[PDB]
Amino acid sequence: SSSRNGRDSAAQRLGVKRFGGQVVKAGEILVRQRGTHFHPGVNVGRGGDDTLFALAPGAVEFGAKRGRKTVNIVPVARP
Amino acid sequence: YRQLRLERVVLVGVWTEGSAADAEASLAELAALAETAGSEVLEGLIQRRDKPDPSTYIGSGKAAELREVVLATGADTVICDGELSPAQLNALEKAVKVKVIDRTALILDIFAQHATSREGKAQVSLAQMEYMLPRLRGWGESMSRQAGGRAGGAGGGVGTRGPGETKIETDRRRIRERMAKLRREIRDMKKIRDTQRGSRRRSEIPSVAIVGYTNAGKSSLLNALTGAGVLVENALFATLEPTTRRGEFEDGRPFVLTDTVGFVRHLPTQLVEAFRSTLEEVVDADLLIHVVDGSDVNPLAQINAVRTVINEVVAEYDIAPPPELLVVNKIDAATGVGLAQLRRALPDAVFVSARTGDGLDKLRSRMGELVESTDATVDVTIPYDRGDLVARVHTDGHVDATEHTDAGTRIKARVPAPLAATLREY
RNA sequence: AGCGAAAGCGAGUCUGAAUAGGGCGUAUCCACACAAGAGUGUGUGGUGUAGUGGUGUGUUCUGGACCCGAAGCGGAGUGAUCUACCCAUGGCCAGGGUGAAGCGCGGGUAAGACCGCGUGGAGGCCCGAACCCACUUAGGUUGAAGACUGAGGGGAUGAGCUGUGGGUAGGGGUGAAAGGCCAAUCAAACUCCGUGAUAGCUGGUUCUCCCCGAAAUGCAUUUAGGUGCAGCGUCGCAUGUUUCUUGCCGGAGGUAGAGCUACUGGAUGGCCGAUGGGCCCCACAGGGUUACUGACGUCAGCCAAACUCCGAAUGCCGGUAAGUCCAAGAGUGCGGCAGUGAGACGGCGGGGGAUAAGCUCCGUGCGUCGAGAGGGAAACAGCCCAGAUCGCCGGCUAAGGCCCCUAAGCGUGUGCUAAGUGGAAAAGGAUGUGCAGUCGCGAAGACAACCAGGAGGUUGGCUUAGAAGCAGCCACCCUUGAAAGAGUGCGUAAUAGCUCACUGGUCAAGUGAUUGUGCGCCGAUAAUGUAGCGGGGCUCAAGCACACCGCCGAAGCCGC
RNA sequence: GUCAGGUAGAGAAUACUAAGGCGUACGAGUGAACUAUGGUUAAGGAACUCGGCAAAAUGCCCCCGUAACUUCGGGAGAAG
RNA sequence: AAAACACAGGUCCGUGCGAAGUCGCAAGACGAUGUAUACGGACUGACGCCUGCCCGGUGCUGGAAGGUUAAGAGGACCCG
RNA sequence: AAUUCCUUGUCGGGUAAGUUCCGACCUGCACGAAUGGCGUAACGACUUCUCAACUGUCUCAACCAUAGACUCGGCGAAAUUGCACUACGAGUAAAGAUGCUCGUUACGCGCGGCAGGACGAAAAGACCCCGGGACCUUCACUACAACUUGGUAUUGGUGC
RNA sequence: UUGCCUCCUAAAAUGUAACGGAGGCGCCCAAAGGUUCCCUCAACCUGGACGGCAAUCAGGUGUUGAGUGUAAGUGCACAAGGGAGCUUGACUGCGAGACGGACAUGUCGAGCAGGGACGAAAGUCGGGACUAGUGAUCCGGCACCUCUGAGUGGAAGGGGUGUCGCUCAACGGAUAAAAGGUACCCCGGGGAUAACAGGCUGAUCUUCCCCAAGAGUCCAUAUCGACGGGAUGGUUUGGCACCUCGAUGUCGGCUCGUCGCAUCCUGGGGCUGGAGCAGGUCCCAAGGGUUGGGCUGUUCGCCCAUUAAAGCGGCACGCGAGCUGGGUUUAGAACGUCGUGAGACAGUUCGGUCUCUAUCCGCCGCGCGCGUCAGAAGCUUGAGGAAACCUGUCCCUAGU
RNA sequence: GUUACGGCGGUCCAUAGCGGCAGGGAAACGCCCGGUCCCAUCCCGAACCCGGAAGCUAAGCCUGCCAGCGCCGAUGAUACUACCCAUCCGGGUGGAAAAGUAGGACACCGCCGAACAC
Ligand SMILES: Nc1nc2c(ncn2[C@@H]2O[C@H](COP(=O)(O)OP(=O)(O)CP(=O)(O)O)[C@@H](O)[C@H]2O)c(=O)[nH]1
Known part of the structure; x- marks a missing residue:
């Protein structure tokens, strides 16, 4: 005599963490996603739950490949 | 009025009395009625109990047998060929665990959908409502767990508890009150019928009417015997309001022919109460036309069931019952080889077919014969300065106009009291 | 002097195979080399380290712990002088009836059985005062009285009533059993003590000014009116513009919108039309005809919170240049002290509901009230204007206003309204009145008018009482082209009168249909009294629209 | 708890009185409504009302006369 | 104030005698100076005609062949 | 039916008219034999119906007398109480206004009466919810009294 | 219903509630894990012995519509999809830097060393394409250890590392261990929260309408009006919980009224399928009037007699500081049914205390005072208000 | 320098792709002719791998035309939208789509150049 709904999960705080042009450290998490909505580019690896992370200091720079997004890092070149 | 879904029905019924064939005949109407409401009929079990059970109509184990059949065919309903009390139809619900809604309820509901005129709708709600008054505690959800009470009764002082009455009384009062408004409303509609029939009342006219059970024709005989095309659907209760048309034979006096609603066996003694239109007619007629099917x-x-309802009418109104003609139809197209039996002992078993096959010739000529006496007869000598003597002399309803001369006209015809009247100068 | 669970070691130490990472320590700072720019390390020199004990103040622990207030729990006692029952010994019951056993005598019977007449005086017997109750009614109901009174009422030789003296005591007594009674108290009496019981609950908490100034949110909870932590406030210390606003630059998205031949569903008409049903030749070999159905295909028109080939505006993250800068009284870290954790309404975007509520639940660098005075909305926390340091018998204004109430305009120019519209309302009905175009006739005097025009085979059929121009109706190729159609409508059963598409002398502008374009009319409709302008009153606008000109108006702004 | 006068009367009821004791502690007025307690009522006689609540009615002695039913006592002061 | 309690009359169960039952920690007392035709408890409730079927559940009573199981007796084997 | 929801079941009596009453039927929502079944003379301040007699119960009220009420003299309280020279209508407000808005009405002060309002007085709502008590029940938990079972001490001897 | 995972609501970052809308999870796999290498579906056309239409084999067409252990989403044809050969990294000592964040938890990590697997070596490997498949602390069990050992030597006990024990599923887990009744009730609070009345709304209710398919002897509109649509009123059942729980007394009846008109009679009309007598509709109209009984607690309802008629509603469902107390709603008792039982029924039946001296406004009557430009007296005008307002039968006109 | 092979260019990976018609073989790329050897098929020297060098541009690959199918796509309007104004409607200042239209487009550049000169 009631609703057969009413249960949800928790909101996993996904999405992009570092946006483009932002100076980053070695090992910071750039994107926490589920699939590969962003594929890893240069100096960017992929974790076990498909999160991307930095492999070198620099500045995160979004890009493209053959029909798929990438998240790159360009080095910051100390003056 | 309630409208949901079914189409899955298992019919049940106690054969308290009647022949075997007679017994399954009832269950059969129930099939036709069930389908006339539009729902597929699966199985159908009948028992032989000399008299129903005060708790479950059929029995205890038979209820158990029905419980499994309802799980088998998944039928969402069960209809009982009888009138059952609120209690019996509530116990049998926890047994089979599905609809246990009786016959009177099928008929009362068919009348809700099939009926159009506003008047017809009102009479329905009365019926449905009078059928639901005696079922309030049973539908006791409004009282289901209405145990919220225990109101203190220190009394002789503040209680501020307004109910100065039990909830059953207060609630019963409402349904009974609405029923009373409708009651006065329906009795008023009487004046509308009477006023729509003032012309016919005056100018006395003949008035044949067509009684007979449902599916016997009636509205086929009218659509053919005169003219006009009224609903002639092959289902049940297809005419929920009376119609009247003109027509005549040699005596053109209207032989106004009315068509009525159908008298099924064992009326639900509810919706029929307000179906007085058909009966107001039976009373005020010059003949009746019991149509029965040969198929x-x-x-x-x-023939007897229908005749019974006609019996009660003549009884209340203290009337010399009108002449009645019983015309058999469905013959010719007679899906009946049991035809001869009726013919052995049946009055006016005309092979009316109403469909193709006609058969209406003998009836028409034998129709005016039973109608009440005419009252116009006259032979006269009319001067040549007529131009007026035609009053209705030729131009009248039955005015004969059947004799002539050279001198004006030695007319020899028939004339009503208010028409040619006494004016005629022999 | 620290690290370690510890043995122990000691500016180190623990874990580890590690001379290798880390963890916790070596007060902090400055200088110099070597490394490393994976975010700074490592050694060498200097400087060199702050605790403790009185005591003022703010929180806090254990104590009654800011104050007041339960129903009830335990220990030891007091009560049977009221009431419940019982024990011992006394007292009382006017008057009048009825007539049991027993006995005697007659009748009666084998006898018994019983039946009359005397005698007798029985009974939880009858009528009825004292006495004991308390059934009905009325009065009282700050009473004469903390349970009575006046009338009636029940028992009254009994399971009766009553006096004196005794006995049973609290988780116990006593109970012809009502949770009744046990000193006007009873689902466990009263008094004193533990005791200042304990209450997430209610109430109360007392002199002043100055500065700052909230919240009704998130998570968890034997939790939902409580509390813990975070958020927001204040005070102190440290850093210094890191905060905020605007412009430019670099990014991710999938809402609004749109689209569907780009997926998944729904879905309106056609067209080809296999594949199947009827009929089919009834061979099941087989001719196809198909009001059926026709998967896919195909043409055109569509829809979607859980459809997306696309896809904004804003918002968000970062960078960069400025602004504000004798102030936002900005941000951030650490401490002392909190309160708050029931929000309300209005705007915009949504769920639940009937796309009801002054309904309910969310979002919103949204607002006001809460915690906000002043002016306008007639009055009127949540709407509009505006944020009160004090004084003034100074000036300018905001929202709103300027006929009188009531400060300032019965203001100026051009138009509209006849409804008191203004000063409530719908589907819909409708010959109101201004505007603007359009269409034939179109100052030819068209149109209106007085008017000759009356049964063309006109009683046609369809049929015949006649179908009496004319019950009804399915057509007006029709003309001296005049202005009547095989004469329709009112009528007229039949007559009989006149027009409906219609017109000739007299001759002076009219016929529709649009934009709905302004403003208006009806629909319209409760119950104390006009009562749907705040009042009087207003069309001689004091109403409406568009321009224009002043002024009144607050604790706003200026002056002193 | 004890005494218990006289007339009526079955009575210790009730009415009036003897012996004896009291006038018992706010009064004087005054035809208001209204309330309480008594009294009377035309014609009708439960029509009132939840309900004959209340009121009215019956009432004593002496002769007659007494039903269904019965557990044989009664019912019974039946009723009249 | 009653239709409720009691009641005379029923049946069942317990009790062989400082009985059963009750008050009391115990002695003791009531039962009763009573003795199963007596006493206590339960239900029914004058009187008349009657009181039907069921012993699976749960109780009560009466039984034993096995299973199960406490303390007390037992002390192999192991360990310090 | 002190038991029947449907229900004012149906039929018969009683009344001019009978949701109550009496007698039957039986379909017993959900009677039933010592939580006794069905009857029954007598009995009841028990409950429910009908009738005769009677009446101010009523149609429909009227009059009389006492005790109050009312006037005069003496004595002389009470509950209640933020204020006070405490109108009405249509509105507006915590949504039901003597006290706010706009009107309308109304000279000041008393005495006898009536009870519409002051959400009138009295009693920190007996109903409802939350929190805490209390007493009661049981196949709720955990204990204890009481009853019962065995070992062992008081407790010993000869037999087999 | 209570914890975890996925989608939408969720307003293009993250987050976001409701007893909003849909589903899953308390596993499985010793290969369905690690690694090296290879491959590309589904469907459609043309072909067979079945084999349907669709089982294996041919040739084409086919870029993703198939398949991924399991819900959904995000992905994946470069494949994470299909196949094969070895194997155990489903490791030990660690972990720069971060995400998320009340806290407790949770999550991702390049890289260094030891010992391996697979590869030619580049390198990959700390379980599975990802996100669920779980439980804090306390108290104990077990294996190993270069810790401690109550005078000393041992030992018992304790300690470290690895790990095992809970539908503590009310899933941040009050106790190792716990159900009901109260109408016999009591106390502390609450209009934070219900019953009565009021307020907002108007689904249901009620009263009107708009269009006109039909009905009405023929005939949409004399009289009705279906399917659909638009509203008024605030008298019903409701929805919300805004005042009142340091009290706003609750049905029916009695007594007393006052108001609205949506008119029952009486009074005017229009239309009639209005011959007359009687009617049926619609408009105008609120001055007066609108009965007595039987049954029921009853309002309502049916019935008996009448009448010109026996109106509908508002006023705390008007009216208890004006009355009753039949009913509902305390404590007693009984029946039927439910519960093992205390007790329950929103079933029935018998019985069950109705308090108050009127202060203020209001209303009905009655005085005293002053005023009305000197003090008195007789008789009056009427601004303004109040009261009343009903109706029948018979006769003549006329049996016209 | 002409230049008809590689590998990634690497391109916000179809303006680059499919589909037609006509052409080419210097070296290179290829089909090809056989498996004795290294190594291979769940069966097959088909493929993988090996040894070759008789023909021949059928095909892959490359070149030139085609706007046929797909693919990019403006300007201007329109939807929508932030802020502001407005007593009920609706406007102003900025930003601006989707679909369509005009059109674009049979790719363009790097490298030891790889080959081929002089
Ligand atoms: N086979 C057949 N059927 C006939 C004949 N005559 C009449 N019928 C049937 O009778 C029916 C018509 O009569 P109907 O209109 O049903 O009578 P009705 O009583 O008005 C139906 P309702 O119950 O609604 O009033 C038709 O369905 C037709 O099948 C006949 O001659 N032959």
Whole structure:
């Protein structure tokens, strides 16, 4: 005599963490996603739950490949 | 009025009395009625109990048998060929665990959908409502767990508890009150019928009417015997309001022919109460036309059932019952080789077919014969300065206009009291 | 002097195979080399380290712990002088009836059985005062009285009533059993003590000014009116513009919108039309005809919170240049002290509901009230204007206003309204009145008018009482082209009168249909009294629209 | 708890009185409504009302006369 | 104030005698100076005609062949 | 039916008219034999119906007398109480206004009466919810009294 | 219903509630894990012995519509999809830097060393394409250890590392261990929260309408009006919980009224399928009037007699500081049914205390005072208000 | 320098792709002719791998035309939208789509150049 709904999960705080042009450290998490909505580019690896992370200091720079997004890092070149 | 879904029905019924064939005949109407409401009929079990059970209509184990069949065919309903009390139809619900809604409820509901005129709708709600008054505690959800009470009764002082009455009383009062408004409303509609029939009342006219059970024709005989095309659907209760048309034979006096609603066996004694239109007619007529189908297993049955309702009418109104003609139809197209039996002992078993096959010739010529006496007869000598003597002399309803001369006209015809009247100068 | 669970070691130490990472320590700072720019390390020199004990103040622990207030729990006692029952010994019951056993005598019977007449005086017997109750009614109901009174009422030789003296005591007594009674108290009496019981609950908490100034949110909870932590406030210390606003630059998205031949569903008409049903030749070999159905295909028109080939505006993250800068009284870290954790309404975007509520639940660098005075909305926390340091018998204004109430305009120019519209309302009905175009006739005097025009085979059929121009109706190729159609409508059963598409002398502008374009009319409709302008009153606008000109108006702004 | 006068009367009821004791502690007025307690009522006689609540009615002695039913006592002061 | 309690009359169960039952920690007392035709408890409730079927559940009573199981007796084997 | 929801079941009596009453039927929502079944003379301040007699119960009220009420003299309280020279209508407000808005009405002060309002007085709502008590029940938990079972001490001897 | 995972609501970052809308999870796999290498579906056309239409084999067409252990989403044809050969990294000592964040938890990590697997070596490997498949602390069990050992030597006990024990599923887990009744009730609070009345709304209710398919002897509109649509009123059942729980007394009846008109009679009309007598509709109209009984607690309802008629509603469902107390709603008792039982029924039946001296406004009557430009007296005008307002039968006109 | 092979260019990976018609073989790329050897098929020297060098541009690959199918796509309007104004409607200042239209487009550049000169 009631609703057969009413249960949800928790909101996993996904999405992009570092946006483009932002100076980053070695090992910071750039994107926490589920699939590969962003594929890893240069100096960017992929974790076990498909999160991307930095492999070198620099500045995160979004890009493209053959029909798929990438998240790159360009080095910051100390003056 | 309630409208949901079914189409899955298992019919049940106690054979307290009647022949075997007679017994399954009832269950059969129930099939036709069930389908006339539009729902597929699966199985159908009948028992032989000399008298129903005060708790479950059929029995205890038979209820158990029905419980499994409802799980088998998944039928969402069960209809009982009888009138059952609120209690019996509530116990049998926890047994089979599905609809246990009786016959009177099928008929009362068919009348809700099939009926159009506003008047017809009102009479329905009365019926449905009078059928639901005696079922309030049973539908006791409003009282289901209405145990919220225990109101203190220190009394002789503040209680501020307003109910100065039990909830059952207060609630019963409402349904009974609405029923009373409708009651006065329906009795008023009487004046509308009477006023729509003032012309016919005056100018006395003949008035044949067509009684007879449902599915016997009636509205086929009218659509053919005169003219006009009224609903002639092959289902049940297809005419929920009376119609009247003109027509005549040699005596053109209207032989106004009315068509009525159908008298099924064992009326639900509810919606019929307000179906007075059909009966107001039976009373005020000059003949009746009991139509019975030859394509019926036993035609004689409906003859008596129908005749009974006509019996009660003549009784209340203290009337010399009108002449009645019983015309058998469905013959010719007679899906009946049991035809000869009726013919052995049946009055006016005309092979009316109403469909193709006609058969209406003998009836028409034998129709005006039973109608009440005419009252116009006259032979006269009319001067040549007529131009007026034609009053209605030729131009009248039955004015004969059947004799002539050279001198004006030695007319020899028939004339009503208010028409040619006494004016005629022999 | 620290690290370690510890043995122990000691500016180190623990874990580890590690001379290798880390963890916790070596007060902090400055200088110099070597490394490393994976975010700074490592050694060498200097400087060199702050605790403790009185005591003022703010929180806090254990104590009654800011104050007041339960129903009830335990220990030891007091009560049977009221009431419940019982024990011992006394007292009382006017008057009048009825007539049991027993006995005697007659009748009666084998006898018994019983039946009359005397005698007798029985009974939880009858009528009825004292006495004991308390059934009905009325009065009292700050009473004469903390349970009575006046009338009636029940028992009254009994399971009766009553006096004196005794006995049973609290988780116990006593109970012809009502949770009744046990000193006007009873689902466990009263008094004193533990005791200042304990209450997430209610109430109360007392002199002043100055500065700052909230919240009704998130998570968890034997939790939902409580509390813990975070958020927001204040005070102190440290850093210094890191905060905020605007412009430019670099990014991720999938809402609004749109689209569907780009997926998944729904879905309106056609067209080809296999594949199947009827009929089919009834061979099941087989001719196809198909009001059926026709998967896919195909043409055109569509829809979607859980459809997306696309896809904004804003918002968000970062960078960069400025602004504000004798102030936002900005941000951030650490401490002392909190309160708050029931929000309300209005705007915009949504769920639940009937796309009801002054309904309910969310979002919103949204607002006001809460915690906000002043002016306008007639009055009127949540709407509009505006944020009160004090004084003034100074000036300018905001929202709103300027006929009188009531400060300032019965203001100026051009138009509209006849409804008191203004000063409530719908589907819909409708010959109101201004505007603007359009269409034939179109100052030819068209149109209106007085008017000759009356049964063309006109009683046609369809049929015949006649179908009496004319019950009804399915057509007006029709003309001296005049202005009547095989004469329709009112009528007229039949007559009989006149027009409906219609017109000739007299001759002076009219016929529709649009934009709905302004403003208006009806629909319209409760119950104390006009009562749907705040009042009087207003069309001689004091109403409406568009321009224009002043002024009144607050604790706003200026002056002193 | 004890005494218990006289007339009526079955009575210790009730009415009036003897012996004896009291006038018992706010009064004087005054035809208001209204309330309480008594009294009377035309014609009708439960029509009132939840309900004959209340009121009215019956009432004593002496002769007659007494039903269904019965557990044989009664009912019974039946009723009249 | 009653239709409720009691009641005379029923049946069942317990009790062989400082009985059963009750008050009391115990002695003791009531039962009763009573003795199963007596006493206590339960239900029914004058009187008349009657009181039907069921012993699976749960109780009560009466039984034993096995299973199960406490303390007390037992002390192999192991360990310090 | 002190038991029947449907229900004012149906039929018969009683009344001019009978949701109550009496007698039957039986379909017993959900009677039933010592939580006794069905009857029954007598009995009841018990409950429910009908009738005769009677009446101010009523149609429909009227009059009389006492005790109050009312006037005069003496004595002389009470509950209640933020204020006070405490109108009405249509509105507006915590949504039901003597006290706010706009009107309308109204000279000041008393005495006898009536009870519409002051959400009138009295009693920190007996109903409802939350929190805490209390007493009661049981196949709720955990204990204890009481009853019962065995070992062992008081407790010993000869037999087999 | 209570914890975890996925989608939408969720307003293009993250987050976001409701007893909003849909589903899953308390596993499985010793290969369905690690690694090296290879491959590309589904469907459609043309072909067979079945084999349907669709089982294996041919040739084409086919870029993703198939398949991924399991819900959904995000992905994946470069494949994470299909196949094969070895194997155990489903490791030990660690972990720069971060995400998320009340806290407790949770999550991702390049890289260094030891010992391996697979590869030619580049390198990959700390379980599975990802996100669920779980439980804090306390108290104990077990294996190993270069810790401690109550005078000393041992030992018992304790300690470290690895790990095992809970539908503590009310899933941040009050106790190792716990159900009901109260109408016999009591106390502390609450209009934070219900019953009565009021307020907002108007689904249901009620009263009107708009269009006109039909009905009405023929005939949409004399009289009705279906399917659909638009509203008024605030008298019903409701929805919300805004005042009142340091009290706003609750049905029916009695007594007393006052108001609205949506008119029952009486009074005017229009239309009639209005011959007359009687009617049926619609408009105008609120001055007066609108009965007595039987049954029921009853309002309502049916019935008996009448009448010109026996109106509908508002006023705390008007009216208890004006009355009753039949009913509902305390404590007693009984029946039927439910519960093992205390007790329950929103079933029935018998019985069950109705308090108050009127202060203020209001209303009905009655005085005293002053005023009305000197003090008195007789008789009056009427601004303004109040009261009343009903109706029948018979006769003549006329049996016209 | 002409230049008809590689590998990634690497391109916000179809303006680059499919589909037609006509052409080419210097070296290179290829089909090809056989498996004795290294190594291979769940069966097959088909493929993988090996040894070759008789023909021949059928095909892959490359070149030139085609706007046929797909693919990019403006300007201007329109939807929508932030802020502001407005007593009920609706406007102003900025930003601006989707679909369509005009059109674009049979790719363009790097490298030891790889080959081929002089
Ligand atoms: N086979 C057949 N059927 C006939 C004949 N005559 C009449 N019928 C049937 O009778 C029916 C018509 O009569 P109907 O209109 O049903 O009578 P009705 O009583 O008005 C139906 P309702 O119950 O609604 O009033 C038709 O369905 C037709 O099948 C006949 O001659 N032959």
